[PDB]
Amino acid sequence: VRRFDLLKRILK
């Protein structure tokens, strides 16, 4: 819920 690509963002 607006989540899990946003940890595929923390690796960037």
Side-chain angles (χ1 to χ4, degrees):
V1 76
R2 260 296 197 143
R3 214 81 177 115
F4 287 182
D5 69 334
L6 100 326
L7 318 190
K8 315 319 277 44
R9 197 83 148 272
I10 75 168
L11 96 132
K12 68 198 290 289

Short mmCIF file of all heavy atoms in Angstrom, two decimals:
data_model
loop_
_atom_site.label_atom_id
_atom_site.label_comp_id
_atom_site.label_asym_id
_atom_site.label_seq_id
_atom_site.Cartn_x
_atom_site.Cartn_y
_atom_site.Cartn_z
N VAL A 1 0.83 -1.21 0.00
CA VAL A 1 0.00 0.00 0.00
C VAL A 1 0.87 1.27 0.00
O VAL A 1 1.57 1.55 0.97
CB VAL A 1 -1.10 -0.10 1.09
CG1 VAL A 1 -0.60 0.12 2.52
CG2 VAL A 1 -2.26 0.85 0.82
N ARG A 2 1.18 1.74 -1.22
CA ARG A 2 2.36 2.58 -1.56
C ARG A 2 3.74 1.98 -1.18
O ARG A 2 4.74 2.69 -1.21
CB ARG A 2 2.15 4.04 -1.06
CG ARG A 2 1.72 5.02 -2.16
CD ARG A 2 2.79 5.19 -3.25
NE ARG A 2 2.56 6.40 -4.06
CZ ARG A 2 3.48 7.22 -4.55
NH1 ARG A 2 4.75 6.97 -4.44
NH2 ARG A 2 3.13 8.31 -5.16
N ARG A 3 3.79 0.67 -0.88
CA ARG A 3 4.97 -0.10 -0.44
C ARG A 3 5.79 -0.67 -1.63
O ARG A 3 6.46 0.11 -2.26
CB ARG A 3 4.51 -1.13 0.62
CG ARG A 3 5.53 -1.41 1.73
CD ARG A 3 5.59 -0.39 2.87
NE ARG A 3 6.57 -0.83 3.89
CZ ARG A 3 7.71 -0.24 4.25
NH1 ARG A 3 8.12 0.87 3.72
NH2 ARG A 3 8.48 -0.79 5.15
N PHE A 4 6.00 -2.00 -1.69
CA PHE A 4 7.16 -2.76 -2.24
C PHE A 4 7.51 -2.73 -3.75
O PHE A 4 8.04 -3.72 -4.28
CB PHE A 4 7.27 -4.17 -1.61
CG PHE A 4 7.77 -4.30 -0.17
CD1 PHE A 4 7.92 -5.58 0.38
CD2 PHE A 4 8.15 -3.18 0.59
CE1 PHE A 4 8.43 -5.74 1.68
CE2 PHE A 4 8.57 -3.33 1.92
CZ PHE A 4 8.74 -4.61 2.46
N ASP A 5 7.66 -1.51 -4.24
CA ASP A 5 8.82 -1.09 -5.01
C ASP A 5 9.63 -0.11 -4.16
O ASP A 5 10.85 -0.15 -4.22
CB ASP A 5 8.41 -0.42 -6.32
CG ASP A 5 7.75 0.97 -6.13
OD1 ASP A 5 7.15 1.20 -5.04
OD2 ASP A 5 8.23 1.91 -6.78
N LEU A 6 9.06 0.60 -3.19
CA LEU A 6 9.85 1.55 -2.37
C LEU A 6 11.01 0.99 -1.51
O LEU A 6 11.90 1.76 -1.16
CB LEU A 6 8.88 2.50 -1.65
CG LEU A 6 8.51 2.26 -0.17
CD1 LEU A 6 8.42 0.80 0.29
CD2 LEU A 6 9.45 2.96 0.82
N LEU A 7 11.20 -0.34 -1.34
CA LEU A 7 12.53 -0.91 -0.96
C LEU A 7 13.42 -1.37 -2.13
O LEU A 7 14.64 -1.24 -2.08
CB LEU A 7 12.46 -2.06 0.07
CG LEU A 7 11.48 -1.89 1.24
CD1 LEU A 7 11.72 -3.00 2.27
CD2 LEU A 7 11.58 -0.56 1.97
N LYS A 8 12.83 -1.61 -3.30
CA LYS A 8 13.55 -1.59 -4.59
C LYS A 8 13.95 -0.15 -4.97
O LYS A 8 14.78 0.02 -5.86
CB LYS A 8 12.75 -2.28 -5.72
CG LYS A 8 12.09 -3.62 -5.33
CD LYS A 8 12.96 -4.57 -4.45
CE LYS A 8 13.97 -5.42 -5.22
NZ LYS A 8 14.70 -4.66 -6.26
N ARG A 9 13.53 0.86 -4.19
CA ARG A 9 14.09 2.23 -4.17
C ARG A 9 15.21 2.44 -3.13
O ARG A 9 16.13 3.20 -3.42
CB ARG A 9 12.92 3.20 -3.94
CG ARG A 9 13.21 4.66 -4.29
CD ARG A 9 13.02 4.94 -5.79
NE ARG A 9 12.55 6.32 -6.01
CZ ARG A 9 11.29 6.72 -6.04
NH1 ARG A 9 10.28 5.91 -5.89
NH2 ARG A 9 11.02 7.99 -6.19
N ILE A 10 15.22 1.79 -1.96
CA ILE A 10 16.29 1.99 -0.96
C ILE A 10 17.65 1.41 -1.43
O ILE A 10 18.67 2.03 -1.15
CB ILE A 10 15.92 1.50 0.46
CG1 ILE A 10 15.93 -0.04 0.62
CG2 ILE A 10 14.60 2.14 0.94
CD1 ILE A 10 15.85 -0.52 2.07
N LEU A 11 17.66 0.39 -2.30
CA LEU A 11 18.92 -0.14 -2.87
C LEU A 11 19.62 0.78 -3.91
O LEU A 11 20.64 0.39 -4.47
CB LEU A 11 18.70 -1.59 -3.39
CG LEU A 11 18.38 -1.76 -4.90
CD1 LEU A 11 19.23 -2.85 -5.54
CD2 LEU A 11 16.93 -2.15 -5.10
N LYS A 12 18.95 1.85 -4.34
CA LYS A 12 19.16 2.54 -5.63
C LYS A 12 20.63 2.77 -6.01
O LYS A 12 20.88 3.61 -6.88
CB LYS A 12 18.36 3.86 -5.63
CG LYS A 12 18.92 4.88 -4.62
CD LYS A 12 17.92 5.99 -4.27
CE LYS A 12 17.68 6.95 -5.44
NZ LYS A 12 18.87 7.81 -5.70
#
